[PDB]
């Protein structure tokens, strides 16, 4: 019975097929759009930080991988709409489990999870990513965070989405 040798056909045939390996790192494979990559702190179109420092993301984290401290948005130095912003925001990626409960928790969409995943270091401390590393890059039309809200607008306008560069 040639059936007992069927395996030899499988391996031999697969010899002549193009290998299915993804070419990471030179040609990295496509991650799912919904993949739970690095957390990211997002900004409003005018550049203000979305994070209001409510600590809900930290509240919901099962691994205590987020440390957040809020501070007042004083008129001289405002970073987010409303009266609170996240002054200190750290994610201990050696405790993060990528569960995504933080982004589900966030009430402002300030915290998202990008598809970026490359992360590693030889030092434990270097993987405690602070606010500086997590903040999204400043895009076109955005100003420095320490600036007053958009003219003729208020927190409710930001949350309703009625703000533009």
């Amino acid at each position: 019975f040639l059936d007992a040798l069927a395996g030899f056909a499988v391996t031999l045939g697969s010899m002549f097929k193009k290998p299915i390996t993804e070419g990471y790192p030179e040609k990295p494979g496509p991650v799912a759009p919904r993949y739970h990559g690095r957390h990211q702190l997002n900004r409003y179109p005018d550049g203000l930080e979305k994070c209001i420092g409510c600590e809900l993301c930290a509240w919901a984290c099962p691994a205590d991988a987020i440390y957040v401290e809020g501070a007042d948005n004083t008129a001289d130095e405002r970073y987010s709409p409303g009266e609170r912003y996240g002054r200190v925001y750290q994610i201990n990626y050696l405790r993060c489990i990528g569960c995504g409960l933080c982004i589900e928790a966030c009430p402002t969409r300030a915290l998202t999870m990008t598809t970026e995943y490359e992360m590693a270091d030889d030092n434990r401390a270097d993987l405690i990513w602070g606010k500086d590393k997590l903040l999204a890059p400043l895009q076109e039309g955005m100003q420095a965070p320490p600036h007053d809200m958009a003219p003729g607008k208020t927190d409710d306008d930001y949350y309703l989405g009625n703000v533009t560069p």
Binding site: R34, L101, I103, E104, A105, R109
Partner: protein, 407 residues
């Protein structure tokens, strides 16, 4: 006598012992005269750590025991939480269908890992690679649906973490179409192979009486011809609505268990096709806002996060919506005091969950009767008297996942 007997640690660090299983074997020559199991090298205190996290956080914990059956752990947990809540009848039909589909794809994935690691332990080097190719297709589907390749927390008390993405259904159809063809490759390597049969057939014999005495379940039990499956007996998640045959064999040996797993993959493919047919648009979370997970994840240029519509509703328009979001996210639902036992048919047998709530927002006591833990009691029966090589095959047939064993 003693002079002719060695005692050797098959040990945690050993290719066939999944790194954290310690088979202490007393061998006369190379025949396993006696067997013992050092367990707990992978203990994690998950059961105790659950007690300090709310519900819907314990999902992330339970999914990380029996990590090869994440969706089964999550489904058992969520079925228990809902049963304590008394909302098992309120789960949306779409949520139940998705739970069944995911558990069946997960059964295919877990059986693929079992066959891969067993073949590699038995020298079938290409078996691991082909099994992991099929598993990688399944994991692409899982990643698209849940955003994670493993330890998903996608199934939540009262439904699912989020609805399927638009492309998930097409990917699952593509699986239902290609997966049997790919599994044909792995089956060809092993099913009828003379060496494979010689290596597994008649190895690790365990009669039905032994399975009952040790409380064995899953493929090991059903290799004795008993068609016991919790999906048919004591149905859950609406398994009663699916036409599938309980795979069983009468060999009672390693090859019978292997064939049972192979055939269960095909049965799971059939069940997933049925799920696709039954799948209808609708909610994936209970309508009861007092319990429903308030988050609404959506994608954008920024990434994955709470949908702007939900953000607007809770920060701009609804005070009650904001309160509900805040509370259900932060401390979570509080489950009425009670004590429940809920069982599912994980790929390795009856995955049972004894769960106790003291009326608080955290589970008072969660215990998993992981099938691997009980199945490992069959190693003494299935290894004693055979050679060490036969012991490898028997242990692989038990297909333990030490995460579920130790927990």
């Amino acid at each position: 006598q003693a002079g002719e007997r060695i005692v050797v640690n098959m040990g945690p660090q050993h290719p066939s012992t999944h790194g954290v299983l310690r088979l202490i074997l007393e061998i006369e020559g190379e025949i396993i005269t006696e067997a013992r199991c050092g367990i707990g090298y992978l203990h994690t205190g998950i059961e105790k750590n659950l007690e300090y996290r709310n519900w819907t956080q314990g999902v992330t914990f339970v999914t990380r025991m029996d990590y090869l059956s994440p969706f089964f752990n999550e489904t058992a947990y969520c079925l228990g939480v809902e049963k304590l809540l008394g909302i098992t009848d309120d789960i949306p039909e779409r949520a139940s269908v998705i739970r069944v589909m995911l558990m069946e794809l997960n059964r295919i994935s877990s059986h693929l890992v079992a066959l891969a690691t067993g073949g590699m332990e038995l020298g079938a080097m290409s078996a691991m690679f082909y099994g992991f190719r099929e598993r990688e297709e399944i994991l692409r589907v899982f990643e698209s649906i849940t955003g994670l390749r493993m330890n998903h927390a996608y199934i939540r008390p009262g439904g699912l973490a989020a609805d399927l993405p638009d492309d998930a259904i097409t990917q699952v159809r593509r699986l239902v179409e290609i997966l049997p063809k790919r599994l044909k490759d792995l089956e060809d390597l092993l099913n009828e192979n003379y060496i494979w049969k010689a290596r597994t057939v008649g190895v690790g014999y365990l009669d039905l009486t032994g399975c009952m005495a040790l409380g064995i379940t899953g493929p090991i039990l059903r290799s004795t011809g008993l068609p016991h499956d919790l999906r048919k007996a004591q149905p859950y998640c609406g398994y009663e609505n699916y036409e599938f045959d309980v795979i069983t064999d009468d060999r009672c040996d390693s090859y019978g268990r292997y064939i049972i797993r192979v055939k269960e993959m095909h049965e799971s493919v059939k069940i997933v096709e049925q799920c696709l047919a039954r799948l209808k648009p609708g909610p994936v979370m209970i309508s009861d806002k007092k319990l429903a997970w308030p988050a609404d994840l959506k994608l954008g240029p920024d990434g994955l996060g709470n949908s702007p519509e939900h953000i607007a509703k809770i920060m701009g328009r609804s005070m009650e919506g904001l309160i509900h979001h805040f509370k259900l996210v932060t401390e979570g639902i509080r489950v009425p005091p009670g004590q429940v036992y809920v069982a599912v048919e994980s790929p390795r047998g009856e995955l049972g969950v004894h769960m106790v709530s003291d009326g608080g927002t955290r589970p008072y006591r969660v215990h998993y009767r992981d099938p691997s833990f009980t199945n490992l009691q069959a190693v003494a029966a299935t290894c004693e008297g055979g050679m060490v090589a036969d012991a490898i095959a028997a242990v692989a047939s038990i297909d333990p996942v030490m995460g579920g064993v130790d927990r």
